[PDB]
């Protein structure tokens, strides 16, 4: 069969939307790591309008935030559609709407909800290959305009990867999209070229790439006009793109501009922690893990694992192993993967999974599921 | 009441709806209702409306082409008047909140040229991915909790606009985790169901209206046991609600507008997106074949993705996967599916009628599970049943 | 019921006045309620806030440079509430509407370099025009249909919130026409009062109420005659108001904030300005001079111009205009003028004692003929005579 | 005695906030001669909003109105502060609030309040000297930036003129203020000398400018920040500049964005026509009219004529010509003055009153009140 994936660069609306509202997030988080924070952005021509609820003592710029956030990502002319110099800003945020416990970790869930994490052996980062290489292709462009390799390159881009598989393994890649925003001073010709050189082989194993691989970059011609000129951008629009391509389900909660105390985020982050063990300690080659709350309930409503015939011990074993190895209680989740710290801004582009040096990416548990279970 | 270390073996599956006084499917109506009102003057209109809500205004925006005069105002205060929000006392009033446009008029770059002889030979107007599914769990081909789910919300709709339990106010969300035995149900593990209210009721008083009126007319009998756990309004007091105490996007429910987490998901919105847009039209024709596929007697529970590229008609990958549950062998089934079925884009536009005023409906409760909607019709299923010799 | 061509002859002179309820006046309340809670932490802020509501939203912009940290929403709620829409029935509310910010840092060309070693030698940060004007037809040294024009719809906000006629709303207009001779007033010849209300009241309860209520308070019978026309909700129900029914803006409304027309005016706006803006301190200290000279006994009108040079510390002019009302030659008033008073930006500052939250309460029912305001102070009267020689 | 006024640019942000208000008037008026229009802008960093209240059955785009609005002014790139392409439009326009008569003309007011008219003999325009020049300075450094002479000045502008008086006569010209915006790529000392000679000098009267006249050419330096980057701007906050520069008395109502029915606007239009045509017939020579109206009445509620001891005949007189000779009813003025027409936009910047293609600025009555009176 065939499975196809797509990622978006950090130029892109939606994205813009996503990390403005993680900015402002970390900018808050460092001054107060207990803040509640529910940021939701809104980006469309000549303007940024960020809204929510804040409940926090930090003090903080708004305007500059978001300034500074579209500055690094490169809209600074309005040659661009774009610039982070002369948009408006405007804010509309509140306060969030007017019992506790002895020991926080046993605090109920702000909402309820379902999440899920998801690994499998198939890349080195144990993610879906489709969601991985695309993401790397739009990572690639963004490297490329910004260290002046192909200075022509503009902001917005968008790149979408079809795999073939056979019996689970991969055999190659069927189909690429490119698409990025450049400027007036490059024809398509020479555009296709260079993406080709500098931005597909250089990422795309060869292995992967046959004479039938279909290679469509810019598809329809020219793409000068991008980023917020031509489309609305919202928080939390990319929710598969910031996961996992589509490969594996999905509960329905955006991640950015969202504290740890909020379920959607936190509970997708430590069901990928729990996924990622498991495949990392050689228990399965894919596995999803499914978890839901109530609000007002510390407990998860339910847990399920799902190894697709891949497990190597039995799965009534695995649901034991991540109840005894893993706090997925909310605030449980705050304090097993050490979440109070303005790290999340990174994560608003190119995928919050895949990256090693993210707390719920660390496989520190790999071998003690490994002797927990027969050994090694 | 069940204690910790009591099963743990259960294979329990979770999922979640809105009724459409939550925030989120507020602006999603709105999304839809203007496109609506849009369509009824010109079918052929190219609609891209993104709304916020905010305590105390919508703003709509994004990107409209069209020959259609249409008032944002007025059908942004009929939409929120239906839905039941007219009243400061609610945190949100119809008839004296804002209603901002930022609507533009799309890029140049879109061109209008590059043409086609036959129009269904059109590419599509940008890449992505889209997933449909069906399962004979339900006689309308759903799967169970996300069904069940909707059901309970809208029934909280049900008696609170007919008068039953007036008390009730328009935001409310629900959750049901189902138990499943090898492949089939066997039962309801957990009900959630959050609903806001008037300050003229108590919370005891609450709960129990909520079990007699909206959970046990939806909730088969026989699903619920004294296993079952009962979660309603599990924080208290839910007075303040709808957009002001929450900001609402379009597009931020495509989970609970779909299949619950049961399926896979795109990850593109529906709502405000008129029927050249693939993230829409294809996901209800990835509907359209998984429903005929189940519908035919050739699997049991049947899953569509489908991907495209801008300028591309024919779709980039077509994949069913059927989870063991096929009659045929599953590569014969892709082949009836590319043949059975046209997949590009205009031609979705055809193969579904989908040049009308249906889609504010669509906004809240669902996309799919109710019949009179064009992709949930069945009407191929006994050609596919033929086509694959049986 | 004066029929035309019956006098033609008589001088009239017309000014109106609107309450604090009237959407524009509400705007000019949130700039300078934030202005106040910024002076109340920082009194060396620099302070341009600009409001704009609408049905259902107040947008608070401009630019702002402190070290105060304020809550925007906060404040905006509070003076709307205290203004008197709380409820979604009178067409907004401040509970429930949105409130956007805005509010920028000020340009890096503004610059905080460029100093002066006395500090009271700094230039003017704009150019512009300012009037400063008394005239002693009244007690406090102000023109007499301002003057009245404002006590009608301030006397329409008292009855209104303590009671008295409770179906009133906030929103309303007045305006008054006096009949001079030669310089002295003979009578009232047309009072104008439109006020909202809700739908507990007919028309005809309403005149008659607001004529034993409002009107009869405040205006003395000596002036009224059988000739008085009375205009009392002149177009029947007023009922939708507020920012309902209309846009308010800060700074339109500023010949109802000075003189009510009798004198000219510069065109600068008064509220969400900081002292150093000499729009604002430079209209006061000008009415500090007139009333001051009028005070003296040195004239019995007086009107005064002065402008400024950004980056100027010495007014580019200084113009006193005395009607032929002087008892010293107008050359020497203006001598006197230049000596007396510091009117230099922030000498101003200094003689007026200005850097104190006190803008809030000018921001409805006129800035001027208060004579708690230290601009209303006639503290150098004597001195001002003994230098004339009197 | 010295007297000053001022004016601003149509680069300014207050004023550009005007235009857009009387291009929107403009646009509706084009296809809807009797629409009521009360549109209110508020232009800052990035954004225009476009609010009030319309009913019309004319079909306008408020966007490209807008947009060209901005071109037309000038403000076409992010390094001067603003775009008219990339900047963000947002509508907030609603309807009007939610009886008649047999006669339009018989129309009551739709609005209380006051309004004054001013002439002069001491301009040629029958204006006053100081808001004369200043307009006349700000529209030269607009000629002179749009014709390509002076290419690095920028469309923010303002002027201040303070003339000398002497007897009601003008001796001169004492103190002139120019500011104006401009590029990087000219020193203030090149700056100076270039203003003086192809905007001051041409314009300002040379028997006027003595060795004691005071130049403040940019006097605090750079002025490369300017426009709605700086400085909110707001409709109707330019309302002296507008009328008379203070010279005259004003009543408080705001013009641009206001259709003809508004008798803010219209009533004073028609007070012009009245204090000119008496100046233009030597009746006086210098004439101040206020006018007020009741809400629902069509008579003025007061009619009152001052001519500082200048008129020529008795006072008395000259009010029994002003009701003689004009029609002062709120819809009588619109048919007086044939206001049903797209013509405001180019009243929203440089005065309304001083231009002589203007309707209110025609002395076709001048020849009839002299006769009226005692002949020629
Ligand atoms: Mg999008
Ligand atoms: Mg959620
Ligand atoms: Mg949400
Ligand atoms: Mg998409
Ligand atoms: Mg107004
Ligand atoms: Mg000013
Ligand atoms: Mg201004
Ligand atoms: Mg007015």
Same mark, same amino acid.
């Given at each position: 069969?065939?499975?196809?994936?797509? @990622?978006?660069?950090?130029?892109?609306?939606?994205?813009?939307?996503?990390?403005?509202?993680? *900015?402002?997030?970390?900018?808050?988080?460092?001054?107060?790591?207990?803040?509640?924070?529910?940021?939701?952005? !809104?980006? $469309?021509?000549?303007?940024?309008?960020?809204?929510?609820?804040?409940?926090? @003592?930090?003090?903080?710029?708004?305007?500059?935030?978001?300034?500074?956030?579209?500055?690094?990502?490169?809209?600074?002319?309005?040659?661009?559609?774009?610039?982070?110099?002369?948009?408006?800003?405007?804010?509309?945020?509140?306060?969030?709407?007017?019992?506790?416990?002895?020991?926080?970790?046993?605090?109920? %869930?702000?909402?309820?909800?379902?999440?899920?994490?998801? %690994?499998?052996?198939?890349?080195?980062?144990?993610?879906?290959?489709?969601?991985?290489?695309?993401?790397?292709?739009?990572?690639?462009?963004? +490297?490329?305009?910004?260290?002046?390799?192909?200075?022509?390159?503009? &902001?917005?881009? $968008?790149?979408?990867?079809?795999?073939?598989?056979?019996?689970?393994?991969?055999?190659?890649?069927? *189909?690429?999209?490119?698409?990025?925003?450049?400027?007036?001073?490059?024809?398509?010709?020479?555009?296709?070229?260079?993406?080709?050189?500098?931005?597909?082989?250089?990422?795309?194993? %060869?292995?992967?790439?046959?004479?039938?691989?279909?290679?469509?970059?810019?598809?329809?011609?020219?793409?000068?006009?991008?980023?917020?000129?031509?489309?609305?951008?919202?928080?939390?629009?990319?929710?598969?793109?910031?996961?996992?391509?589509?490969?594996?389900?999905?509960?329905?909660?955006?991640?950015?501009?969202?504290?740890?105390?909020?379920?959607?985020?936190? %509970?997708? !982050?430590?069901?990928? !922690?729990?996924?990622?063990?498991?495949?990392?300690?050689?228990?399965?080659?894919?596995?999803?893990?499914?978890?839901?709350?109530?609000?007002?309930?510390?407990?998860?409503?339910?847990?399920?694992?799902?190894?697709?015939?891949?497990?190597?011990?039995?799965? +009534?074993?695995?649901?034991?192993?991540?109840? +005894?190895?893993?706090?997925?209680?909310?605030?449980?989740?705050?304090?097993?993967?050490?979440?109070?710290?303005?790290? !999340?801004?990174?994560?608003?582009?190119?995928?919050?999974?895949?990256?090693?040096?993210? &707390?719920? +990416?660390?496989?520190?548990?790999?071998?003690?599921?490994?002797?927990?279970?027969?050994?090694?």
């Amino acid at each position: 069969h065939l499975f196809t994936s797509e @990622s978006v660069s950090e130029g892109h609306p939606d994205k813009i939307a996503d990390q403005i509202s993680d *900015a402002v997030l970390d900018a808050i988080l460092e001054q107060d790591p207990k803040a509640r924070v529910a940021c939701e952005t !809104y980006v $469309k021509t000549g303007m940024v309008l960020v809204g929510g609820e804040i409940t926090t @003592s930090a003090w903080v710029d708004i305007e500059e935030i978001t300034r500074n956030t579209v500055r690094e990502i490169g809209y600074v002319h309005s040659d661009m559609g774009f610039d982070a110099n002369s948009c408006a800003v405007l804010s509309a945020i509140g306060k969030q709407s007017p019992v506790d416990r002895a020991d926080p970790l046993e605090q109920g %869930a702000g909402d309820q909800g379902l999440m899920f994490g998801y %690994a499998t052996n198939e890349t080195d980062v144990l993610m879906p290959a489709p969601i991985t290489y695309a993401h790397r292709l739009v990572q690639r462009q963004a +490297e490329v305009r910004k260290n002046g390799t192909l200075p022509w390159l503009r &902001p917005d881009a $968008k790149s979408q990867v079809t795999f073939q598989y056979d019996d689970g393994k991969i055999v190659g890649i069927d *189909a690429v999209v490119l698409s990025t925003q450049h400027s007036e001073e490059i024809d398509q010709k020479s555009l296709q070229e260079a993406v080709m050189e500098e931005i597909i082989k250089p990422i795309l194993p %060869a292995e992967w790439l046959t004479s039938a691989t279909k290679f469509f970059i810019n598809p329809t011609g020219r793409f000068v006009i991008g980023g917020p000129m031509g489309d609305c951008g919202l928080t939390g629009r990319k929710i598969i793109v910031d996961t996992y391509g589509g490969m594996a389900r999905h509960g329905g909660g955006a991640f950015s501009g969202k504290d740890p105390s909020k379920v959607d985020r936190s %509970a997708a !982050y430590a069901a990928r !922690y729990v996924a990622k063990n498991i495949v990392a300690a050689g228990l399965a080659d894919r596995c999803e893990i499914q978890v839901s709350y109530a609000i007002g309930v510390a407990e998860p409503t339910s847990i399920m694992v799902e190894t697709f015939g891949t497990e190597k011990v039995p799965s +009534e074993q695995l649901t034991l192993l991540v109840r +005894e190895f893993f706090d997925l209680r909310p605030y449980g989740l705050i304090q097993m993967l050490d979440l109070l710290h303005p790290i !999340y801004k990174e994560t608003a582009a190119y995928g919050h999974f895949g990256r090693e040096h993210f &707390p719920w +990416e660390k496989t520190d548990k790999a071998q003690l599921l490994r002797d927990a279970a027969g050994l090694k």
